[PDB]
Nucleic acid binder design. Structure first.
Ligand SMILES: [Zn+2]
Ligand SMILES: [Zn+2]
Ligand SMILES: [Zn+2]
Lengths: 105, 814, 71, 397, 131
RNA sequence: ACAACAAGAAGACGCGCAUCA
RNA sequence: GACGCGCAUCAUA
């Protein structure tokens, strides 16, 4: 996600697994969050696919209902041949939102 | 002192206050962490943490500030490791998942920052403590500090802790450390599998029950971590397990069964069968057990044994089921929840192998039970079975029983359960076109449920009809579908929005599944009735209504007159205020959907007039709508109106039109080669140093256009924009520099790396530092992509007295 | 910090990169490019009367330390 | 101002030549590779002619080409390593007469680069794994298996990176139903770029490492590291298991060295020189390419020098160790890039510049008048070139 | 002082050591014959009209995505190996339509609103006229 | 036991101006 | 450096 600069990608050797996308983010690009012209399929490394992490969403982490795709611009720029797009950082925004949601109810 | 008072004031600012004050205090403490010092700061922050009456909010802020100050002090926290650990350890046993994960992360960071020997010596006296809670916390700490810095950095310590003879507490703690490392690591212990198996194997024949049980649990954890590979490492462990199966009873028997069940899948087919036979010889007599945890363990063992490919189906159907269906299918099993899920999963995977018919035929009669929980359990069972195996094997004698059972289950309900509707939809879809002779019963039941009992099951009935419209259409039926549609029509005006959304979704599904020209109520009679619904503030009703409006506009447009579309537009301009992304996207799409049918003259004027909201949310949606309508229509009929609006002296309008141009160029793609000349003077004027936002938007436009027009050979006008993009690199704002970098990388593929290299070779070795940093960053960006293409564009550099910088291989002449 | 592509990759420079390092990196890249292509190798082996194996062996030797000794 | 590209003649420069049973029948075929065109051709034992049956353009530089088969299989699958950042597996369908892609795995950026694998490609002779490697810092291993549907599969790549290493050649070592082994000529240069005195450039010998693939452990670990006294160029795989000892042959300047891991000592054998050579004595002698004829009874090797002399290398071995290396002058042919020794005595010579020749092996040179050579002779050898009298020309391309 | 513009760029992929514009067969138009260092001979042919050029461009665009190359290498990226392609249509890709699957050939034909018998004749006419 | 979820509302930034030490 | 105000960016949720 380009909106949040603090997010860090896994950036490892992609395996043969297939990424998944939930209903909240269905047609978004895994890199630039675009909405036009899906091009290729997203692969992830075996570390991101083990036990409870199998079938989870790539960006946020919800249940997987659709496959992840690269847009045409990312394919032209060859940004897909980098690694798995799975985000390993939990994110300071989500935990903080949960923290001031829990106290208020 | 003064420093202590300052730390008191900033700590009070961090603890309580407005978010701006807290973030300012955090940024200043991160800026001045080194100057403040570590000693007094830690001696000041620890007493607040150790207080048992601390609220979670200030505890989280204190942990965050500790994390912020930890990485700045690379080596100054060595003497404070013990005093920080003795306060921070209890945070890894709380039930809060986020708290546990941030505690694990902070302990990993502390282990990385500190040294191995000092912390090892710190935690030496924690092994022999008599408290079990502190031993468990120490085991978790050892696991996380072993995940940090690597396993081999701690491997020799494992031998020392596991070979202790004075007491069994040290050995138990070592085995716990091993199992926690296996659990927390995942599949990263595969290279270090044997080094752990050999050290842990000796504990299976000890005289203490605790050490044997913990060793069995750790072996099970290791087998779980190394699921597909590693039988050669465990080949020396099997025989003690079989020897201990018969001798041990109780908790140790449970641990041994769990371990052996985990190791079964790792073997080959012949060995798997040979050993699962012996496992079953005790499993059959072991199904009878009073404890629920042992029932869960044996269910997991059965699941894992059935999952093995080496066990053939005839043995399964001859042995396992006759006791399974007689012992594990009772009311008490459905009473619990862990047993609920475990039994459901085991039954599903058993049906995946032995056959769906055999499983289903003995549980269809269970749908007539008076208990609601047991009916829910069996309904989930068939729903999951038919989700995977379909309904191609079920026979008519079984199909009618299943239909009767599901109808009985749906007819009476104590509360509202979505599992009933989900299962009914799954069974109906799996049956396909063979549910045709039962359609009138379903229609009568859904009508009866919809017509009465005060809007409690009406929304579920709407969901059911929305799910079954497809099957009723595929079963060659239209008349009762139209009757249901018209019935929903007089049932459209409800006060409750929750049922209104479901009814609107049902109507939308009916419109999707059947033709628009064959709908029983004329299309002209819906939109006047549907327009007041758009003013509702509820989310689901708005979603369903906007989806229905978009579908009608895309499909039914010749019937609808061009008078109410204006009112729909003026209502959608207000509906754009909605928070959810789906509603905004649907409204933006339906703008273009209706402007395809209606000439883009009044639509553009309405959108352009609402570009001065002063709210950022509305302008982005409006400009995306402008882009999508421009893409849908011919771009030459929408450009001059957009350009004429640029002369307004409002900066918001200029930003909006520039963003619309960017989005339009992104959408059209290869069609931008004909209109590239038109926007060149506008981009030239915008790129001038007048404001940062305008330059950023112009850079985005340049990037998108350059990416779109690649492959056509139009660099004559693209090269002119580089002379204006290049001077904008020297900026400090992250957004503008990101936009400029993106524009440069987009232009790199369109113009060729030669021009970029020529531009970069000007001040690559400039005497200053910041310009060198910028140029080197740009050069690295160009170098990562299309590295091979830079060979032919490298400049010639003459060699000096000492070195040879001339590439003589390219000077050969034939 | 999304600069992971620059640090992990080999050959990327920075402010404190000397001229000799850049020159030797580009020389090694040029040698690899010569070796990869076939028509360039044919041109090199036709310009001087040698064999493809001999040219490849010489290119292997020249990759140890080009541009002379460092300063 | 719009042009259109037409092509009249296709490229005829052979770069890589492989042989095997690609169609699945009992007749051998040769898959030659041009710069960017993949071609399939088979010889006719009846009329002694060569005809092309397939020609497809791949639109890219083919940097490597290998063939292999699965355990117990009857068909050969072609593995192609190109300038792109991916590896593909091809299968030939005789009925369709087209190439069908079986698998496609991407592991890096496209284009000829330095740290992108594709230059060196080695396969397990048994057919259980394949290896791909780059010039520097990057090696990758792919494990191949088959499912119950009798279809070839592939697993995730395994990292075998090593910083500051210049790989000269990668070849697979044949073992008998054991962990796969790969031999490479690694070479470090970290110290050579640190000392400005200049002696680091010299006295920097290259090693010969062995890589072990642990199927149970699913990782690759370095086993041994043996420095070499001189510089070598490429390696040859000696068949192992039940047919011959397991080992590799190292070709260098004026010398050939047999080397094996364990208790096997090193054997050094000089290369014979032409009698009354007019060349500069300072010039050395190296090998360009080699072949292998794995006959059921006994196996030998064929090698070619810079001048085109063909030698016949024969290994005499004990129960476990090898005694000596025997060399024998076979014939003289124009310098070629690769040889393909087919069944029924067919020799294919793909010249690097000029026409291509097909030779029929009429005699094996048994009990020849000219003497042989061996490493047991103390102290340099000489031989007299002569007409062929051992191969008969049949077809010319 | 006075720079010169470039009106054509391409990447044959092989080293070229000869260029000559002449007529090959009697009764035909001129062409730019070039020979490479690998043994291939090729010519460059200008179009005769604009509809034919548009049809060739559409065929190339359809076959770029619908018929990917054998080794999984992008055709546009390969032809733009050093410099972007300028006003050149690749005939090697366009002439691969004959070996394509019959159903895919049909789909392409009704995407172009033509017939494979007419497409083959159109493809062969440009080769016959200039060679 | 290592186990991910519900809408009283929040995450990263910047440019300008008033007062005080 | 401290107490404040206004404007504006990221199809931010
Ligand atoms: Zn990953
Ligand atoms: Zn998601
Ligand atoms: Zn993208």
């Amino acid at each position: 996600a380009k909106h949040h600069p603090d997010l860090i990608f896994c950036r490892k050797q992609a395996g043969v697994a297939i990424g998944r996308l939930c209903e909240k983010c269905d047609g978004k690009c895994v890199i630039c969050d675009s909405y036009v012209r899906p091009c290729t399929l997203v692969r992830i490394c075996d570390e991101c696919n083990y036990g409870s992490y199998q079938g989870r969403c790539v960006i946020c982490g919800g249940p997987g209902v659709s496959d992840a795709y690269y847009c045409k611009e990312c394919t032209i720029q060859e940004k897909d041949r980098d690694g798995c797009p799975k985000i390993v950082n939990l994110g300071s925004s989500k935990t903080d939102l949960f923290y001031e949601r829990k106290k208020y109810g | 002192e003064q420093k202590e008072r300052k730390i008191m004031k900033l700590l009070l600012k961090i603890k309580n206050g407005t978010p701006p004050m807290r973030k300012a205090a955090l940024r200043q403490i991160t800026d001045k962490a080194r100057e403040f010092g570590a000693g007094p700061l830690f001696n000041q922050i620890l007493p607040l943490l150790m207080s048992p009456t601390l609220e979670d909010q200030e505890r989280h802020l204190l942990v965050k500030v500790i994390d912020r100050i930890l990485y700045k002090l690379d080596d100054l926290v060595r003497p404070y490791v013990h005093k920080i650990l003795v306060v921070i350890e209890p945070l890894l046993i709380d039930e809060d998942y986020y708290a546990r994960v941030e505690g694990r992360e902070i302990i990993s960071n502390l282990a990385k920052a500190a040294g191995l020997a000092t912390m090892i010596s710190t935690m030496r006296p924690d092994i022999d403590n008599m408290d079990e809670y502190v031993r468990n916390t120490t085991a978790r700490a050892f696991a996380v500090v072993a995940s940090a810095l690597g396993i081999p950095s701690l491997l020799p310590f494992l031998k020392a802790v596991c070979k202790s003879k004075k007491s069994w507490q040290a050995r138990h703690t070592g085995i716990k450390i091993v199992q926690q490392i296996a659990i927390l690591m995942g599949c990263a212990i595969l290279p270090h599998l044997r080094s752990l198996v050999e050290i842990i194997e000796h504990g299976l024949v000890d005289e203490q029950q605790k050490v044997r049980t913990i060793s069995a649990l750790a072996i099970a954890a290791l087998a779980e971590a190394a699921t597909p590979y590693g039988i050669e490492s465990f080949d020396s462990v099997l025989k003690p397990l079989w020897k201990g199966i018969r001798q041990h009873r109780g908790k140790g028997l449970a641990a041994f069964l769990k371990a052996i069940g985990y190791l079964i899948p790792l073997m080959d087919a012949e060995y798997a069968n040979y050993y699962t036979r012996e496992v079953m010889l005790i499993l059959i007599r072991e199904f009878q057990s009073p404890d629920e945890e042992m029932k869960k363990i044996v269910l997991k063992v059965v699941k894992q044994c059935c999952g093995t490919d080496g066990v053939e189906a005839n043995y399964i159907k001859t042995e396992i089921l006759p006791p399974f269906f007689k012992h594990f299918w009772q009311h008490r099993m459905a009473l619990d929840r862990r047993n609920y899920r475990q039994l459901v999963d085991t039954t599903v995977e058993l049906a995946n192998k032995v056959g769906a018919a055999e499983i289903i035929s003995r549980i269809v009669d269970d749908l007539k039970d008076e208990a609601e929980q047991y009916r829910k359990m069996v309904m989930e069972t068939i729903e999951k079975i038919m989700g995977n195996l379909g309904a191609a094997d079920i026979d008519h004698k079984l199909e009618e029983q299943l239909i009767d059972g599901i109808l009985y289950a749906f007819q009476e309900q104590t509360t509202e359960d979505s599992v009933m509707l989900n299962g009914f939809g799954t069974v109906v879809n799996a049956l396909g076109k063979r549910v045709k002779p039962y359609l009138p019963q379903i229609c009568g039941t859904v009508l009866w449920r919809l017509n009465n009992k005060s809007a409690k099951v009406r929304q579920q009935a709407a969901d059911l009809i929305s799910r079954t419209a497809v099957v009723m259409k595929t079963c060659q039926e239209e008349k009762l579908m139209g009757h249901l549609g018209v019935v929903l029509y007089e049932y459209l005006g409800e006060e409750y929005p929750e049922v209104l959304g479901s009814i609107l979704g049902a109507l939308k599904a009916i419109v999707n599944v059947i033709g628009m020209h064959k709908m029983t109520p004329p299309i002209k009679d819906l939109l006047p009735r549907l327009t007041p619904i758009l003013k509702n503030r509820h989310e689901k009703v708005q979603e369903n209504c906007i989806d229905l409006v978009g579908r009608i506009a895309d499909r039914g447009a010749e019937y609808v007159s061009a008078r109410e579309w204006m009112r729909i537009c003026f209502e959608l301009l207000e509906l754009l205020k909605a928070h959810k992304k789906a509603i905004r996207r649907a409204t933006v799409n339906t703008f273009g959907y209706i402007a395809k049918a209606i000439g883009p003259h009044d639509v553009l004027a309405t959108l352009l007039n609402n570009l001065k909201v002063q709210e950022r949310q509305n302008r982005v949606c409006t400009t995306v709508a402008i882009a999508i309508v421009a893409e849908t229509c011919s771009p030459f009929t929408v450009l001059p109106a957009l350009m004429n609006e640029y002369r307004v002296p409002e900066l918001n309008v200029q930003n909006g039109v520039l963003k619309s141009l960017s989005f339009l160029f992104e959408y059209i793609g290869e069609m931008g080669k004909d209109y590239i000349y038109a926007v060149t003077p506008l981009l030239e004027d915008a790129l001038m140093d007048r404001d940062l936002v305008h330059r950023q938007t112009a850079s985005a436009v340049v990037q998108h256009m350059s990416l779109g027009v690649y492959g056509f050979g139009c660099e004559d006008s693209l090269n002119h924009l580089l002379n204006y993009v290049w001077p904008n690199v020297f900026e400090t704002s992250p957004h503008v520099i990101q936009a400029v970098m993106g524009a440069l990388e987009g232009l790199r593929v369109a113009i060729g790396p030669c021009r970029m290299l020529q531009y970069c070779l000007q001040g690559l070795f400039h005497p200053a530092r910041k310009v060198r940093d910028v140029y080197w960053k740009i050069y690295n960006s160009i170098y990562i992509g299309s590295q091979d293409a830079l060979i032919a564009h490298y400049p010639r550099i003459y060699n000096d007295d000492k070195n040879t910088y001339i590439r003589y291989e390219l000077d050969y002449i034939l | 910090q999304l600069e992971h592509l620059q640090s992990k990759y080999i050959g990327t420079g920075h402010a404190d990169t000397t001229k000799w390092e850049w020159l030797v990196n580009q020389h090694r890249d040029s040698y690899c490019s010569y070796m990869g292509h076939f028509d360039l190798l044919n041109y090199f082996a036709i310009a001087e009367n040698e064999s493809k194996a001999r040219v490849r062996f010489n290119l292997m030797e020249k990759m140890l330390q080009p541009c002379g000794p460092p300063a | 101002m719009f042009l259109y590209n037409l092509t009249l003649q296709r490229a005829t420069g052979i770069s890589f030549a492989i042989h095997g049973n690609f169609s699945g029948t009992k007749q051998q075929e040769i898959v030659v590779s041009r710069g960017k065109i993949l071609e399939l051709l088979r010889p006719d034992p009846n009329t002694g002619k060569v005809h092309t049956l397939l020609t497809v353009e791949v639109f890219g530089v083919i940097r490597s080409l290998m063939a292999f088969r699965l355990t117990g299989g009857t068909k050969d699958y072609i593995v192609v390593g190109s300038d792109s950042g991916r590896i593909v597996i091809l299968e030939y369908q005789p009925s369709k007469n087209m190439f069908e892609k079986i698998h496609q795995e991407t592991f890096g950026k496209s284009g000829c680069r330095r740290i992108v694998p594709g230059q060196f490609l080695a396969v397990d002779p048994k057919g259980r794994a394949v290896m791909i490697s780059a010039i520097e810092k990057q090696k990758l291993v792919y494990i191949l298996n088959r499912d119950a549907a009798a279809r070839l599969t592939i697993s995730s790549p395994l990292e075998a990176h090593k910083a500051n290493t210049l790989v000269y050649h990668v070849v697979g070592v044949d073992v008998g139903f054991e962990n796969p082994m790969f031999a490479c000529l690694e070479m470090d240069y970290e110290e050579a770029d640190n000392d400005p005195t200049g002696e680091a450039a010299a006295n920097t010998q290259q090693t010969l490492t062995f890589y072990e693939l642990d199927l149970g452990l699913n990782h690759v670990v370095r086993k041994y590291s043996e420095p070499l006294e001189e510089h070598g160029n490429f390696l040859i795989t000696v068949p192992g298991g039940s047919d011959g000892p397991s080992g590799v042959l190292i070709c260098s300047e004026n010398y050939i060295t047999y080397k094996n891991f364990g208790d096997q000592p090193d054997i050094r054998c000089p290369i014979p020189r032409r009698r009354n050579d007019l060349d500069d004595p300072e010039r050395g002698m190296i090998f360009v390419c080699s072949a292998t004829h794995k006959t059921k009874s006994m196996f030998f090797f064929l090698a070619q020098t810079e001048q085109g002399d063909i030698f016949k290398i024969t290994l005499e071995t004990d129960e476990d160790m090898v005694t000596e290396i025997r060399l024998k002058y076979f014939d003289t042919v124009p310098v070629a890039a690769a040889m393909c020794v087919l069944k029924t005595g067919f020799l294919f010579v793909a010249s690097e510049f000029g026409n291509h020749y097909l030779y029929q092996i009429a005699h094996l040179g048994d009990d020849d008048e000219e003497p042989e050579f061996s490493s047991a002779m103390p102290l340099t050898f000489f031989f007299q070139p002569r007409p062929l009298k051992n191969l008969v020309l049949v077809d010319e391309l | 002082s006075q720079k010169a513009e470039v009106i054509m760029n391409y990447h044959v992929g092989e080293t070229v050591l000869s260029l000559q514009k002449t007529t090959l067969i009697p009764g035909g138009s001129e062409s730019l014959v070039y020979t490479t260092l690998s043994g291939g001979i090729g010519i460059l042919v200008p179009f005769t009209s604009h509809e034919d050029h548009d049809f060739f461009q559409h065929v190339e665009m359809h076959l770029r995505s619908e018929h990917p190359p054998l080794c999984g290498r992008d055709h546009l990226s390969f032809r733009s190996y050093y410099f972007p392609v300028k006003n050149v249509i690749d005939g090697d890709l366009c002439e691969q339509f004959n070996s394509m699957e019959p159903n895919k050939q049909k789909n392409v034909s009704e995407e172009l609103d033509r017939t494979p018998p007419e497409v083959s004749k159109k493809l062969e006419d440009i080769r016959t006229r200039y060679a």
